[PDB]
Amino acid sequence: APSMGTLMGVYLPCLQNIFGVILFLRLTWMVGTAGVLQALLIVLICCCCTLLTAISMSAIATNGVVPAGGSYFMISRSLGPEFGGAVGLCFYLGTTFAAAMYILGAIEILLTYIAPPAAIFYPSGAHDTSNATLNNMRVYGTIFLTFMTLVVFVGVKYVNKFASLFLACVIISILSIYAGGIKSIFDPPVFPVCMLGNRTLSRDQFDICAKTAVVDNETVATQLWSFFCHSPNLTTDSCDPYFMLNNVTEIPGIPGAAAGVLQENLWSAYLEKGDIVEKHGLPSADAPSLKESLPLYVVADIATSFTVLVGIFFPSVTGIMAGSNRSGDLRDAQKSIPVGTILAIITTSLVYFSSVVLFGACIEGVVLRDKYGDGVSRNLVVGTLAWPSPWVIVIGSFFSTCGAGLQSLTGAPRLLQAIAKDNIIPFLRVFGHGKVNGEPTWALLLTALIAELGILIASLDMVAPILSMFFLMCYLFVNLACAVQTLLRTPNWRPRFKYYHWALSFLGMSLCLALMFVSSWYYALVAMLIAGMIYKYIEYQG
Amino acid sequence: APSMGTLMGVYLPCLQNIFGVILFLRLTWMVGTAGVLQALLIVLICCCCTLLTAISMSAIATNGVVPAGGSYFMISRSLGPEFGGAVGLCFYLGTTFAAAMYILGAIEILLTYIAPPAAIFYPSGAHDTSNATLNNMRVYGTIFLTFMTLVVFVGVKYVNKFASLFLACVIISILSIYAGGIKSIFDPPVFPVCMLGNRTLSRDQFDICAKTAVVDNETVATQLWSFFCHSPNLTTDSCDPYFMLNNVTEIPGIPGAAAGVLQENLWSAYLEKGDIVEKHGLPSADAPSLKESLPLYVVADIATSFTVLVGIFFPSVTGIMAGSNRSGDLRDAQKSIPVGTILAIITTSLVYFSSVVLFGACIEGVVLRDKYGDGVSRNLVVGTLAWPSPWVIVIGSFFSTCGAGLQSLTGAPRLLQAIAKDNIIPFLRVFGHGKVNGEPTWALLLTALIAELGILIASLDMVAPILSMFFLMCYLFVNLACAVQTLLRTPNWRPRFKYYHWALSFLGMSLCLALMFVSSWYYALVAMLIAGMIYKYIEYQG
Ligand SMILES: *[C@@H]1O[C@H](CO)[C@@H](O[C@@H]2O[C@H](CO)[C@@H](O)[C@H](O)[C@H]2NC(C)=O)[C@H](O)[C@H]1NC(C)=O
Ligand SMILES: *[C@@H]1O[C@H](CO)[C@@H](O[C@@H]2O[C@H](CO)[C@@H](O)[C@H](O)[C@H]2NC(C)=O)[C@H](O)[C@H]1NC(C)=O
Ligand SMILES: *[C@@H]1O[C@H](CO)[C@@H](O[C@@H]2O[C@H](CO)[C@@H](O)[C@H](O)[C@H]2NC(C)=O)[C@H](O)[C@H]1NC(C)=O
Ligand SMILES: *[C@@H]1O[C@H](CO)[C@@H](O[C@@H]2O[C@H](CO)[C@@H](O)[C@H](O)[C@H]2NC(C)=O)[C@H](O)[C@H]1NC(C)=O
Ligand SMILES: Cc1csc(N(C(=O)CSc2ccc(-c3ccccc3)nn2)C2CC2)n1
């Protein structure tokens, strides 16, 4: 018999789950590659679909009748059980796999940056190859998932504390990054980046960045010159003409917040796979490039385009259902779910916009698209923006991913119990009537096993678009259910009196159905096929 | 009401399906990497498991009661329907996917070698990237699969003709390769291979193989010297010391059949990924190797070991069920299936052994492990062994793969109909009572759709071990069923009177159950789980 109210019941969980980790790490890459304007447009599109879905859900919940079950109950009541069951099952699978991926990301964040100094779990995998890190993940993520499932098994009263602490840490990290940005505007930090000609080269091989140097009144080896130039004598031009013709120089990578940098970084620059990231302002002579010289540069990892960028970014904006599916507590959910969801979504969108604009206007353009940090000692560029130190941002990202995973894991069992509580799927009957007070039991086991299988895979990033397709399908179905319910003599209305809600819901449904289509039609077809199969099975069961 | 007799009914299909294409292309790689002795041992192990399964099947069929259905009916009658249904379903899936992979391999053989000159289907894909070839396959394989399904739909009376022609072509290719081997023993061909120091380098960049040459009474550019050495003047040692210190030379790659080559090629040589294949007899100085010089060599593709080699080779020895599942024709199958299966299996094993020994004793060891042909103009080494020309061997391989795919496609519907003919699986009832005369109809559609999905994947090589696991599970279950049936008061006995059949079946079952385990336990666990799920579903249906 829980009742979590509005603020903690539906606002904090949604905001905490929405943030993810894309803001801390991939946001700089996106802004650098697509420019400020295109990044703003893409974030606006994603937030627009999410806000339209939230508004449709609020309109549906205005009736104040949802007793239990998340969006699945609403969809089943409005449209019909046959579609509602399939949508709920797909959404539950997506939520479980998203929780698994969040936990994996948190574990890998911890391994790479959190405590690599403590052997970076070297005994766990010994770093023989990528398999070593994969095993380290497969073990540590499982060790953490067991604890997460154990904690979530107890009533949510003991779950909201950890989520609140994680959200507090994430907010602290965001405030620190903004303070670092303002300080850089008032006092730029130090962050040298090595650029030869007008290109950029990873500063991980040579100790110093200079074609020639003088030690003991004599020319030096110039380790940089040693690479791509095997002649250790100054009076020699044997190696590639690029070194001799072009010139090497060092430029700040974090010139702070200034009008010039932001204005120069406005437009976008998409590069195909294998290209070399190079600044445009400074000069560079043209000469043939030796094949061996290619590795000693900065090369794009994947092709860059608006559609691919939108597909990559969209998942970071999902998870608005944390406060929707969770309905056991929060008495009088009618007056709580919509306001909380809208507030959290709007705050997240505003923070995303401000962060993207600041990143565009603060950091040097060349560094931004230098993904993986190979350009500068592989260290986190955004971390240096943090006021105190990169540790604050790294720990913030780790806690954010862990908390998002925990919130998704907590949410999934409620939806599973709601689906099974109704005799809609014959073989899910046992997964109902959990512990007293309505807590989900005997379904937490199923969700935990699903997450454990996902962890055992330890490569869920391969099937990235499947979860996005599931989430978009659920949102589109919610929008359509709201539209039909309003059409079919729905008295539920906000203070504004009009029929424009029909058009709004249709616009959102079309918008981020085409969104999923452009993201990956290849997997959208598979997701639609799975939904159809579940719908046919439901029809057979009747 | 068909009756195909013994020879054509059960012998020709099994033998023509067993051959595959591994003999023509990968056999040389296996013999070169693992040596003659280890290749003989591995082929012996695979053929031993296959022959033990065949003998167990013959013992079971000695009762002369199998009216219809392949190994599934035997297993269900002996052990029990619960296991039989699951084993039959897994075997049917494996056969369908094997047919799809065979058709894909045939299409890719045609694209790469059959008719690349006819634009190599350039308009189909334009060769923009690997996606171009993938689309070419996805289209041509479907175009061929539609025709294959259409032909197989008609009674087998119109199917055995194409299989007979394909088997005739394959036998012609085998005879040609043996004749070429004997001729090389009596008259070695010409096949220069470029070796620097004691290593080997692909002869695809430079026109001639010589560190220096004289044209117009002057030193030449020496294109080979241009690669890895960018100084175009003879009086210069700027480039890597390997070229100057070591010496480059040309050696025959096909010295014919001689005692020395075979004796020197006896022992094995396993190399880890990234290694460089080098001969042992000739000398080679030691000096540092430049990083850029690495690509201009011959590098192993994957790690080499006995277990991985056995796992790779085993699928080339399966398919002995072609004459077993097909039982609609061949009246009095009791006196036909065992003799035909044993004869075909023994002939295939003998041909494999002889071919491996000849390959070991004929071709130069260095070339053998030069997979993909990059060592010598990417052209098929085994093709040059053919007496008339490589075209005979290439067409033989293409026809062999096409025929194997066609035979598997023909076999699958019979097993599907047999499974559905019995009300064991509730939802397979519709897939029964095909066209008159017992021909499979309304199940050929399902098998064709499964094959079409596999083609659309066009990358079935990724899940290679799954089909191997399915086949090994089916064979092991057949062996266990034979053992139990003989134990449970089975009067079926051959002229030899003894109870050693129990021990023989147990030995085979253990042998190539551990075979699948060593091949891939990772996927063996998944296959076992799928079989258990099918068994539980069957139990529920009762
Ligand atoms: C890299 O070195 C070149 C050297 O030419 C610089 O271009 C100028 O070249 C003239 C020719 O002797 C010199 O007198 C100038 O001193 C050079 N300019 C400078 C600033 O040194 C080129 O400018 C150098 N790179 C950069 C970024 O300045
Ligand atoms: C860095 O330098 C390159 C080349 O110097 C410039 O981009 C063009 O590159 C082509 C090479 O095919 C040159 O022919 C052009 O002269 C270069 N400038 C143009 C086309 O305006 C550019 O300065 C930089 N390239 C980037 C930033 O991608
Ligand atoms: C590659 O060239 C070397 C050159 O040293 C050959 O080794 C011998 O070196 C001496 C030293 O001058 C020469 O007089 C000999 O003529 C060289 N031998 C030969 C056969 O030319 C080395 O033998 C050469 N490579 C091969 C495979 O013979
Ligand atoms: C080809 O040459 C290599 C090296 O010259 C020989 O294998 C050994 O390689 C190591 C390199 O670390 C040398 O130190 C040894 O002197 C080489 N010979 C040995 C260990 O007996 C060998 O002749 C050839 N390598 C092959 C065939 O793999
Ligand atoms: C060390 C590190 C750096 S960056 C990083 N990352 C993360 O920590 C995120 S892992 C992740 C990815 C996707 C999803 C997801 C959620 C909902 C729907 C679809 C997908 N969830 N979680 C990933 C590469 C960006 N790890």
Ligand SMILES: Cc1csc(N(C(=O)CSc2ccc(-c3ccccc3)nn2)C2CC2)n1
């Ligand atoms: C151009 C070319 C060269 S070599 C080649 N190959 C082929 O043509 C064979 S494609 C193939 C592979 C596996 C199976 C199979 C059958 C039964 C059970 C498990 C696997 N069937 N078919 C493949 C790489 C060797 N193509």
